[PDB]
Design a protein around this ligand. Structure first.
Ligand SMILES: Cc1ncc(C)n2nc(CCc3nc(N4CCCC4)n(C)n3)nc12
Ligand SMILES: [Mg+2]
Ligand SMILES: [Zn+2]
Length: 313
């Protein structure tokens, strides 16, 4: 109850910044996460014993894939932490509670394959969930872990508060389906431009939280260049494995997943920053002005990929 979590001075200062890297020491990531919940939510949001046991069950249910792993989960939660702290008064006690949990849980039991590969393989999960296949699985794995004995971090909540928080987590995790991002950003773009955007409209908040989730999920593009560059290696190492598997089913994979088109990665990053990342942080900066550093850092990394293409690295 009187037990603060603290971090070494460099982490204590740098963790508050959007571009923070959680580092290569796996055993400090649980502590980093608890630090963030305590500062974001209060030391009283969760029974510590239950929270610690929830974090370790979540960790155990991420797999050793190159990118969609426990490190990604904590990175995405840290980005959400920075957004929530730079926008203190815009968010409910329930949202602050739900959204950090949502980010930690959002890729639970990922196998390193896209929804498209599950569908062409005919994986049982593609029969149970026709759209946002992995994302419905991620929410389903979240609920399972919440129902393990001693794991109900939401036990203090009322019956209807509990239902509201699980509904925030569900929509948050569904919104990490990048297929849904495009339409969601377009709608938020037009609502903001016609002045109809209203944060008391629950369906408007949903879209905004949706965009925050895309922003947090893509946050490798908002880091220091060497972090950004080394994460792209992990991202492609999954995609190329999936490409190999596509070829094993006798299907030419899209270029994104073809290791034979390695040389075109820089140009693929350009497309991605222009088609997805820049638009995402642009619209997010408009709706939440204090998130501008994510847009600024995304633009800087775009410029670093331009440099790679021009032979300047
Ligand atoms: C940084 C990042 N964060 C999150 C996600 C989901 N992605 N996806 C990419 C790949 C983007 C991409 N790459 C290509 N290439 C085709 C030729 C070689 C590569 N295309 C067409 N599109 N990068 C990221
Ligand atoms: Mg995902
Ligand atoms: Zn993710």
């Amino acid at each position: 109850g009187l037990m603060q979590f603290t971090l070494p001075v460099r982490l204590c200062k740098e963790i508050e910044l959007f571009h923070f890297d959680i580092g290569p020491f796996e055993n400090m990531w649980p502590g980093i996460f608890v630090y963030m919940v305590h500062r974001s939510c209060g030391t009283s949001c969760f029974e510590l014993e239950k929270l610690c046991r929830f974090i370790m069950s979540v960790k155990k249910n991420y797999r050793r894939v190159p990118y969609h792993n426990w490190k990604h989960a904590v990175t995405v939660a840290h980005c959400m932490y920075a957004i929530l702290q730079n926008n203190h008064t815009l968010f409910t006690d329930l949202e602050r509670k739900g959204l950090l949990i949502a980010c930690l849980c959002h890729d639970l039991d990922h196998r390193g394959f896209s929804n498209s590969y599950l569908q062409k393989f005919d994986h049982p999960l593609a029969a149970l969930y026709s759209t946002s296949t992995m994302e419905q699985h991620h929410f389903s794995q979240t609920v399972s872990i919440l129902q393990l004995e001693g794991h109900n971090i939401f036990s203090t909540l009322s019956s209807s508060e509990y239902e509201q928080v699980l509904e925030i987590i569900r929509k948050a995790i569904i919104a990490t389906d990048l297929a849904l991002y495009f339409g969601n950003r377009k709608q938020l773009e037009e609502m903001y431009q016609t002045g109809s955007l209203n944060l008391n409209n629950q369906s408007h908040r949903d879209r905004v939280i949706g965009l925050m989730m895309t922003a947090c999920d893509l946050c490798s593009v908002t880091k220091l260049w060497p972090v950004t560059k080394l994460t792209a290696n992990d991202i492609y190492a999954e995609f190329w494995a999936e490409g190999d598997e596509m070829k094993k089913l006798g299907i030419q994979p899209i270029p994104m997943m073809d290791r034979d088109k390695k040389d075109e990665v820089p140009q693929g990053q350009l497309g991605f920053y222009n088609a997805v990342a820049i638009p995402c942080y642009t619209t997010l900066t408009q709706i939440l002005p204090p998130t501008e550093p994510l847009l600024k850092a995304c633009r800087d990394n775009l410029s670093q990929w331009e440099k790679v293409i021009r032979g300047e690295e």
